[PDB]
């Protein structure tokens, strides 16, 4: 059966000064998805054809520099993965001699070292997000329009986005995390009360460590879900609200950045939610095998 964690992609970290969210999965930064989105915008305008060069050079290099940086933390990833496997598995934990409190402190120490690595290696890469943003603003300046900028491309991307929004199963995600968090908090309370009568500390501790990680992943799931829900709601409102045939060149610049930001967050969250949903499914099978070991 399932008793070991094989994937620890769920850990993430955010920047302290500019607050970029870093995922262990490509494209690691949601802003890359925005640069991907600007390719679709740029293919519809004669003036900004030069962005195909910018994306193929600056954007994709940043992507590959980001994946390389994440790879620099594979060692710190395996080090914290080894502690997870030890703390979650009673049979594996009994093979060593340190207390559960000692190894839990090492886990916290190695978890932050790995999370800190993901940020420390990407600091130079994160500095590129700003300069690519401004480079896209100046690129949108070369539009020949002034007060006559047609919004056909703007609302055409919105119509496509409403189709792509329906492909992600939001209702299924919401129903899952509600029943999951419900069951999770019950087992946490059940473990707290049967703990005093059963003299099996190792298995209970293995259950409590799994519940600790489950709590972390539940938080990441809930964070991205309502972020997904927000970008879906805002872009939907844009489809329902006013539909001007033309705007100024600066309103259109804000337009593309706004829907590009909302859509980049939606697919970044969609990437994370698919990963996190696999982590919660996995941790639940582990905690179930542990409960069967405890009661049985």
């Amino acid at each position: 059966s399932t008793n070991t964690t094989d994937n620890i992609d769920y850990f993430d970290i955010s920047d302290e000064s500019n607050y970029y969210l870093i995922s262990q999965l490509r494209p690691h930064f949601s802003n890359i998805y925005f640069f991907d989105e600007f390719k679709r915008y740029a293919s519809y305008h004669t003036e900004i054809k030069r962005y195909e060069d910018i994306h193929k050079t600056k954007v994709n290099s940043l992507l590959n520099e980001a994946s390389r940086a994440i790879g620099i933390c594979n060692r710190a990833k395996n080090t914290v993965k080894g502690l997870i496997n030890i703390l979650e598995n009673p049979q594996k934990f009994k093979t060593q001699r340190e207390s559960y409190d000692v190894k839990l402190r090492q886990y916290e120490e190695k978890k932050e070292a790995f999370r800190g690595c993901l940020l420390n290696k990407n600091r130079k890469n994160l500095d590129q997000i700003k300069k690519i943003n401004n480079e896209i603003r100046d690129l949108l300046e070369k539009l020949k329009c002034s007060q006559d900028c047609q919004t056909n491309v703007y609302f055409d991307m919105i119509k496509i986005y409403l189709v792509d929004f329906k492909k992600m199963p939001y209702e299924n995600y919401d129903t899952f995390i509600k029943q999951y968090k419900n069951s999770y908090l019950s087992g946490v309370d059940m473990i707290r009360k049967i703990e005093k009568q059963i003299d099996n500390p190792v298995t209970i501790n293995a259950i409590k460590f799994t519940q600790k990680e489950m709590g972390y992943i539940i938080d990441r799931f809930e964070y991205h879900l309502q972020k997904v829900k927000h970008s879906i709601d805002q872009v939907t409102a844009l489809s329902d609200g006013v539909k001007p045939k033309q705007v100024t060149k600066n309103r259109l610049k804000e337009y593309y950045f706004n829907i590009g930001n909302y859509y980049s967050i939606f697919k970044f969250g969609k990437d994370s939610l698919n990963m996190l949903n696999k982590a919660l499914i996995h941790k639940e099978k582990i905690v179930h095998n542990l409960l069967g070991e405890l009661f049985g």
Partner: antibody, heavy 120, light 110 residues
């Protein structure tokens, strides 16, 4: 009990299109990226394409870019591979592969492959 | 695009072998994402090493993975009859692309 079963191979005429299938089971298909790998009779393994969990993103190798299309149907747990115009060099064994559980930079499960023989 | 592998390596049962896999500064040398797959006749290829050094569950300790510069390596200690197969290295090539090696036939000499 993770199984990948390739299909659609055999004797195919050059200059025509071909669609290969990969039936997946034993794991949550809609949650993983998938890859198409091929091996020529006398050569090594060649990476062709990748498609994301929900099929919204597809990427290709330089030697097959513009010649093939990777696609999936997550309601039937099946991966597809479309060769636009078959050449003689397409004679090969085409492997279906699942993104690995330990991370997205490896593939932990492969199919047995299906033989594509191009001749007129 | 191609990673260069030795065509043939061999050893008697119980000793070691080493399969090199020389890449470029854009694949093997750029990432810590080299893979190793074992392939037997008529069998599905099998992942033996991921992320340069890590082994999937069920892969014996004899199989070892390292990397230096643009060259990754696979070391098989204490060879057995089961180890006779084709081995392929694999490395992330950037922009969601991978690249496999030519392939090395391991024969345990009888």
């Amino acid at each position: 009990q993770v199984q990948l079963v390739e299909s659609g191979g055999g004797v195919v005429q050059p200059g025509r299109s071909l669609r290969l299938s990969c039936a997946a089971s034993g794991f949550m298909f809609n949650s993983y990226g998938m890859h198409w790998v091929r091996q020529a009779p006398g050569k090594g393994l060649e990476w062709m394409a990748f498609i994301s969990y929900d099929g919204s993103d597809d990427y290709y190798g330089d030697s097959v870019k513009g010649r093939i299309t990777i696609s999936r149907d997550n309601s039937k747990n099946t991966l597809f591979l479309h060769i636009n115009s078959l050449r003689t060099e397409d004679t090969a064994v085409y492997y279906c592969a699942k993104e690995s559980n330990y991370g997205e930079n490896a593939f932990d499960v492969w199919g047995h492959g299906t033989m594509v023989t191009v001749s007129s | 695009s191609a990673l260069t592998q030795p065509r043939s390596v061999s050893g008697s049962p119980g000793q070691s072998v080493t399969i090199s896999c020389t890449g470029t500064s854009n694949d093997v040398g750029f990432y810590n994402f080299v893979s190793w797959y074992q392939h037997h006749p008529g069998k599905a290829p099998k992942l033996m090493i991921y992320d340069v050094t890590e082994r999937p569950s069920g892969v014996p300790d004899r199989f070892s993975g390292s990397k230096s510069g643009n060259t990754a390596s696979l070391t098989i200690s204490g060879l057995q009859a089961e180890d006779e197969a084709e081995y392929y290295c694999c490395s992330y090539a950037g922009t969601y692309t991978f690249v496999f090696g030519h392939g090395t036939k391991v024969t345990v000499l009888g």
